[PDB]
Amino acid sequence: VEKVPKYDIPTKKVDYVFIELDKMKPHAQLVQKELEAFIESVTGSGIFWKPMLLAKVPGEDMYLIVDGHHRWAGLQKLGAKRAPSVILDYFSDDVKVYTWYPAFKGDLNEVVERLKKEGLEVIEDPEAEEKAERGEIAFALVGEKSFAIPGGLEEQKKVSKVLDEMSVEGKIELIYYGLKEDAREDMAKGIDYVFIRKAPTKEEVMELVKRGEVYSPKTTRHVLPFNPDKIDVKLEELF
Numbered sequence: 001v002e003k004v005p006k007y008d009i010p011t012k013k014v015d016y017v018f019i020e021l022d023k024m025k026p027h028a029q030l031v032q033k034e035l036e037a038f039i040e041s042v043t044g045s046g047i048f049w050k051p052m053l054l055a056k057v058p059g060e061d062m063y064l065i066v067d068g069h070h071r072w073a074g075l076q077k078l079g080a081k082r083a084p085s086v087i088l089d090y091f092s093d094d095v096k097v098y099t100w101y102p103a104f105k106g107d108l109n110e111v112v113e114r115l116k117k118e119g120l121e122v123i124e125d126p127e128a129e130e131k132a133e134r135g136e137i138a139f140a141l142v143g144e145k146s147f148a149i150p151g152g153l154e155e156q157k158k159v160s161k162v163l164d165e166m167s168v169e170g171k172i173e174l175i176y177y178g179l180k181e182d183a184r185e186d187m188a189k190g191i192d193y194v195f196i197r198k199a200p201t202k203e204e205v206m207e208l209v210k211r212g213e214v215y216s217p218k219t220t221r222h223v224l225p226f227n228p229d230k231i232d233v234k235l236e237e238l239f
């Protein structure tokens with residue numbers, strides 16, 4: 001579930017280009033539920049109406065998937081070969097990369113035991129949010145108390161893996177907030193805990209994919225200068 005801060009992003013009529021799926025590099029782990037929903041949707045209508053958003057990888061004949069992991073992964077699993085895509089000026093100042101702030105209403109202790117059991121630490125720390133925003137720890141866990149979860153990407157992934165299982169189990173009301181202050185505004189209405197990491201930079205996203213590595217789901221949150229207008233492409237054109 002997603003809460004976004006009413007971003008008036010303009011639709012623009014930008015033409016698409018067909019790009020081969022094997023030229024596209026993911027930056028996030030897939031979510032099988034989203035992959036599955038896309039497969040049902042595209043095979044149902046037979047129309048692919050929403051182009052990929054790509055960025056050229058410097059120094060490679062490859063493209064970063066900015067938006068479209070489950071379209072990409074879904075087309076591949078169907079045996080398709082290309083997707084209509086819009087190529088972004090990614091390093092333009094007009095493109096911004098934020099993160100998501102996974103927040104939860106629910107009980108802290110079940111989450112701690114599940115986090116601790118995967119090898120993560122949860123040390124109580126009133127500078128945890130400050131450390132996390134500087135990128136010094138993996139996550140700050142902020143509710144009634146503040147806790148630091150140390151480490152880097154490996155630890156962040158473990159945290160995401162645990163949260164998604166407990167969202168699957170129904171032990172928390174997992175909402176990914178676009179902005180953490182909206183998680184704190186809703187927190188004051190009386191959310192329980194909010195996870196905060198430093199946002200990825202564009203440069204880090206590109207580095208990670210050149211390494212053949214990926215983030216957890218809901219790590220990047222791109223704010224773009226436009227949404228492409230809808231397109232008229234038949235599924236059969238993609239094979």
Ligand SMILES: Nc1ncnc2c1ncn2[C@@H]1O[C@H](COP(=O)(O)OP(=O)(O)O)[C@@H](O)[C@H]1O
Pocket residue numbers: 034037038041042043045047048049050066067068069070071072
């Ligand atoms: N028939 C379709 N053609 C093209 N896109 C579709 C179709 N049905 C659903 N979608 C889109 O596929 C997307 C699935 O998520 P996607 O953007 O690929 O992953 P992520 O945003 O995590 O990179 C959704 O935006 C959804 O609206």
